[PDB]
């Protein structure tokens, strides 16, 4: 689609370019960080739940504090530059300085001397210390995705966009995110399949990493250039933007509740409680399967080039399925089949594509022999099923799960509406991710490996989807009742 007028073009094209560059970098780094962490020497998918908690969220709080104290000393555009340019500096220094020195910075000797002491479940924790530059890459990719996408760009947009433009501009950005998924997938596939220079002695992944980070640097430079252009040619034009507009809404400056003044609001009434249960269950269910799926990827694609090429193809097909969804099942299913079915499609889809995946992962030897008669191994079949599950979730999230969340936010009174919305999006925004990481950390420490914890992940996934299904079924009763009295 292209639902933007002709006069708003000069304002939206720099915005669309900024969003395209930011999402392109986000996808490239999201795939490259998994490639680096999972394919590292002495590392694997077990390092992912340890990073995502013991490095991502403390660095997240550190960066949020630095940003909050920096916004008061720098101007808005100077703040954007001072936050975005360190990212580009790191992504230019990584493949040129930090990755070539990865056999000098990484303390492999101390790392294995430590691993010989810690329990075998802390292999994912000693893989952080063994690959601490790859861990810094993971942290900074997560911080790109958080800061430069959700905080920086979206604050810029919500500040400079008009309310009468916001819906169309955000729909255009939603379709541009899928177009950038397509582009970043093709670019990662190309940079990975560029396993050229047959003359050995060079790192085949070194060239791919140089190409990926070079595309990232060019995209970040185009981002900075479009930001400068929209500041010097648009945000100073009294026709597109005027700071006399958002002051009305900023009179009541955003009162972000800390954690627990909302943890009690999640206990005020069963409505917001069940909605928080839905969000938390989604956040945990999406994370529970990803670590096992990435272990299966490390098994199927040992070297970093094939892993990154699969991640590129996976991003490309996530983009394809996202475009198909946004074009066909955009707002169809919710209004066609009620709120309960729209809220239940995602849990039952995760349930089906997760029990199949965990059956292929647990019953490998039982399946290898029946699947072998179909040309594939249960490892490749589990990889495919996990990729299908991830694609379906990341595709019909924005159209099936978020669309039912916000639809449930409707029949509430404005006070409880905004307060409970803030409560959910302040606690369960990570609570789910951090909990899905902590569950996997505990299961790795207790069980001892990823292959040994997968029978317990399936039981936990069934115990959470059961909560997800029962809470969505109960929330549908309080959603249908309150909607009827709101009519009169």
């Amino acid at each position, epitope marked *: 689609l292209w639902p933007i007028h002709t006069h708003e073009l000069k304002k939206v094209l720099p915005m669309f370019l900024m969003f395209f560059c930011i999402t392109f970098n986000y996808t490239v780094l999201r795939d490259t960080k998994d490639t680096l962490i999972v394919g590292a020497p002495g590392s694997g998918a077990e390092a992912i739940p340890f990073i995502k908690f013991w490095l991502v969220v403390p660095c997240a709080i550190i960066f949020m504090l630095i940003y909050a104290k920096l916004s008061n000393i720098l101007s808005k555009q100077a703040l954007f530059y001072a936050v975005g340019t360190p990212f580009l500096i790191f992504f230019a220094l990584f493949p040129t300085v930090i990755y070539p020195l990865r056999d000098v910075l990484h303390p492999t000797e101390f790392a294995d001397r430590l691993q010989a002491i810690l329990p075998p479940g802390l292999l994912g924790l000693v893989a952080i210390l063994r690959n601490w530059t790859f861990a810094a890459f993971y942290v900074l990719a997560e911080l790109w995705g958080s800061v430069m996408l959700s905080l920086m760009f979206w604050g810029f947009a919500n500040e400079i966009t008009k309310i009468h433009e916001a819906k169309r501009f955000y729909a255009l950005f939603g379709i541009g995110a899928n177009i950038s998924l397509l582009a970043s997938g093709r670019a990662i596939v190309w940079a990975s399949k560029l396993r050229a220079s047959v003359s050995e002695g060079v790192d085949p992944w070194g060239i791919s990493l140089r190409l990926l980070m070079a595309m990232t640097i060019v995209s970040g430079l185009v981002l900075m250039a479009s930001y400068w252009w929209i500041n010097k040619n648009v945000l100073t034009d009294p026709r597109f933007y005027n700071p006399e507009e958002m002051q009305k809404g900023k009179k009541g400056a955003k009162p972000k509740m800390n954690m627990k003044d909302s943890f009690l609001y999640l206990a005020r009434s069963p409505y917001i409680l069940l909605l928080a249960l839905l969000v938390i269950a989604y956040g945990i269910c999406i994370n529970l399967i990803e670590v096992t799926w990435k272990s299966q990827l490390k098994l199927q694609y040992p070297n970093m080039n094939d892993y990154s090429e699969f991640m590129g193809n996976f991003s490309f097909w996530t983009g394809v399925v996202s475009v198909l969804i946004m074009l066909f099942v955009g707002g169809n299913v919710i209004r066609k089949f009620g709120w309960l079915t729209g809220a239940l499609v995602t849990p039952v889809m995760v349930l089906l594509t997760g029990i199949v995946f965990f059956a292929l992962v647990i019953f490998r*030897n039982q399946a290898s022999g029946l699947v072998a008669m179909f*040309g594939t191994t249960p490892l490749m079949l589990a990889v495919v099923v996990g990729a299908i599950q991830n694609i379906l979730s990341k595709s019909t999230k924005y159209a099936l799960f978020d669309s039912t969340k916000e639809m449930a936010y409707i029949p509430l009174d404005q006070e409880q509406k905004v307060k409970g919305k803030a409560a959910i999006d302040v606690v369960a925004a990570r609570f789910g991710k951090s909990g899905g990481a902590l569950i996997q950390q505990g299961l790795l420490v207790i069980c001892g490996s990823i292959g040994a914890m997968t029978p317990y992940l399936a039981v936990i996934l069934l115990f959470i989807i059961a909560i997800w299904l029962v809470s969505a079924t109960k929330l549908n009763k309080l959603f249908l009742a309150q909607s009827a009295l709101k009519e009169q």
Partner: nanobody
Amino acid sequence: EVQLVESGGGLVQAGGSLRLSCAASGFTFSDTYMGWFRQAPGKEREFVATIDYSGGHTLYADSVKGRFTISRDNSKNTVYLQMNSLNPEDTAVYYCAARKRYHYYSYWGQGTQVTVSS
């Protein structure tokens, strides 16, 4: 009806070679997915190799990859399995399996026993 029968089992030595046969009958051989399995006494039946429909796609077990090669002949109805560099771990009764083009269960032969330098 779906009679499968194996041939070529026996013994050579630890590191020898053998060529199994699957001279089947009773179905459209050009439209069936064949393959070879084995079941040592006390172990579970594992697969050795499968041949797609014409020889394009072959899937070997990671324990026999490179050593064994599976080949069919849609004209001369028979599935072959050329076994080379036989290890003492290879001793078992080798079954030939056959799945139709759209079915989901594989018919099994009586199986031929292969032993190598006990």
